[PDB]
Amino acid sequence: LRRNEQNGAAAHVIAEDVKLLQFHVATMVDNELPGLPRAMQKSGRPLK
Amino acid sequence: VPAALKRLAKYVIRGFYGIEHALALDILIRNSCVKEEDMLELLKFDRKQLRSVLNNLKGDKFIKCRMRVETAADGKTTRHNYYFINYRTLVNVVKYKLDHMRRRIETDERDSTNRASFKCPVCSSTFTDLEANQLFDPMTGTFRCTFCHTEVEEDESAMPKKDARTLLARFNEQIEPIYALLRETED
Amino acid sequence: GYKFGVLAKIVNYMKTRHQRGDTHPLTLDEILDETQHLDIGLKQKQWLMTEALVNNPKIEVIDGKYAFKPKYNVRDKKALLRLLDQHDQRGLGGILLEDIEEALPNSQKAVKALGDQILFVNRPDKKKILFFNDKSCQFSVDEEFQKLWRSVTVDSMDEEKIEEYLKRQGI
Amino acid sequence: SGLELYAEWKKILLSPERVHEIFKRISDEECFVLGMEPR
Ligand SMILES: [Zn+2]
Numbered sequence: 001l002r003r004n005e006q007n008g009a010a011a012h013v014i015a016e017d018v019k020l021l022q023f024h025v026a027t028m029v030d031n032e033l034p035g036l037p038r039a040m041q042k043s044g045r046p047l048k
Numbered sequence: 049v050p051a052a053l054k055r056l057a058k059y060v061i062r063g064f065y066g067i068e069h070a071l072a073l074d075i076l077i078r079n080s081c082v083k084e085e086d087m088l089e090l091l092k093f094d095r096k097q098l099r100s101v102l103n104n105l106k107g108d109k110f111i112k113c114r115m116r117v118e119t120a121a122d123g124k125t126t127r128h129n130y131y132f133i134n135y136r137t138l139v140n141v142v143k144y145k146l147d148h149m150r151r152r153i154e155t156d157e158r159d160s161t162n163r164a165s166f167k168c169p170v171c172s173s174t175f176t177d178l179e180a181n182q183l184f185d186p187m188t189g190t191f192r193c194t195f196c197h198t199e200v201e202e203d204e205s206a207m208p209k210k211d212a213r214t215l216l217a218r219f220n221e222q223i224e225p226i227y228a229l230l231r232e233t234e235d
Numbered sequence: 236g237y238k239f240g241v242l243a244k245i246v247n248y249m250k251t252r253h254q255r256g257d258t259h260p261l262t263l264d265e266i267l268d269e270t271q272h273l274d275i276g277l278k279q280k281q282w283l284m285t286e287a288l289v290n291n292p293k294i295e296v297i298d299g300k301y302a303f304k305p306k307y308n309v310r311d312k313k314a315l316l317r318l319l320d321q322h323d324q325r326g327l328g329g330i331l332l333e334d335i336e337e338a339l340p341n342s343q344k345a346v347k348a349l350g351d352q353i354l355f356v357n358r359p360d361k362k363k364i365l366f367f368n369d370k371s372c373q374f375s376v377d378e379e380f381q382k383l384w385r386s387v388t389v390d391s392m393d394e395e396k397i398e399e400y401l402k403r404q405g406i
Numbered sequence: 407s408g409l410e411l412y413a414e415w416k417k418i419l420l421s422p423e424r425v426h427e428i429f430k431r432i433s434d435e436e437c438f439v440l441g442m443e444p445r
Pocket of ligand 1: 168170171172193196197198200
């Protein structure tokens with residue numbers, strides 16, 4: 001995200017990039033969000 | 049629409065923005081209000097490219113847009129985006145970009161002061177000038193660090209500070225020509 | 236081809252003939268001879284004469300006969316510069332580099348000779364779009380200036396805060 | 407919806423930054439009314 005702002009990337013790219021950052025931040029706090037994908041550990045086992 | 053506003057908009061857009069933004073402004077200069085679709089055909093730009101440029105022009109509020117919804121001859125709904133230049137909002141935003149840069153001089157100067165004057169190169173750990181005295185051993189007669197048992201040199205931390213000062217006076221040169229441009233806002 | 240295949244060969248043969256350097260016009264019957272289309276239908280003979288050989292932008296009607304249109308195509312450095320100038324003056328838009336190359340043989344010589352007079356925009360597919368270099372008002376500055384300008388984020392600010400700064404600093 | 411907020415009056419997506427400024431402008435006294443100790 002920092003490079004995109006530094007390089008003045010497309011607004012939609014940042015908007016999509018921000019969405020992924022929001023997912024991981026929310027996912028780390030809680031991996032059982034309502035009606036949202038479960039972030040596995042690359043093996044089908046949901047992260048705690 | 050006084051010619052002073054029209055003349056400046058070209059001057060500013062050609063300065064801080066690429067030819068793509070200037071070309072779009074020319075269409076709005078010729079006609080007070082122009083459809084988004086009409087601009088796309090005239091400029092022949094890509095749909096995503098034009099939208100990104102328009103979004104950037106909307107980011108600084110140089111030109112405003114209004115959405116008109118009507119029924120086409122075949123019955124399908126038509127939503128046309130009409131873009132028009134708002135000089136009153138443009139002047140305020142462009143003026144805001146002056147004081148920030150003008151006041152940016154103070155902010156940049158603080159960056160140099162942040163760097164520590166004394167540093168230890170061997171251990172690659174910044175040494176506080178006061179902490180050096182406590183770390184300094186009176187028996188040895190020269191300041192040293194116990195963990196690495198080597199002499200310290202603060203000359204290295206000196207050179208980066210000098211360069212940053214040139215970047216400041218060099219920064220001011222950029223906004224000097226624009227100061228002349230923005231005088232057309234007040235006229 | 237019936238009603239569609241014959242015309243394609245006429246266009247191809249005509250295009251090749253011009254590349255040889257024969258600017259002289261050619262009649263409908265004359266062109267048919269070298270294209271092995273002597274048995275073309277009568278209704279196609281009038282259709283080509285009335286529609287195909289006039290509506291096409293590469294067919295010039297001269298003294299009744301038909302000839303290529305190298306004038307519209309760019310074949311000189313001066314024409315290349317003039318075409319871009321008209322596009323900017325009338326706001327028609329840019330032209331892809333590939334379109335100029337086919338129209339202008341050895342377009343590199345003309346492009347390099349004009350130099351900065353042509354503005355090149357690289358499309359995602361490597362295609363280059365040419366735009367006239369309007370030298371009326373120019374302003375180029377150091378790279379770091381834009382970097383600092385980019386560092387000043389403005390899309391994430393509200394109008395009230397943006398306008399409040401003016402009175403905050405007293406301007 | 408999901409992790410994104412929508413504001414309608416027409417409709418524009420609300421980003422986390424767009425909400426930060428409003429919260430900063432809130433006075434300490436207003437927090438007491440909202441049942442949240444400012445300190
Ligand atoms: Zn050390």
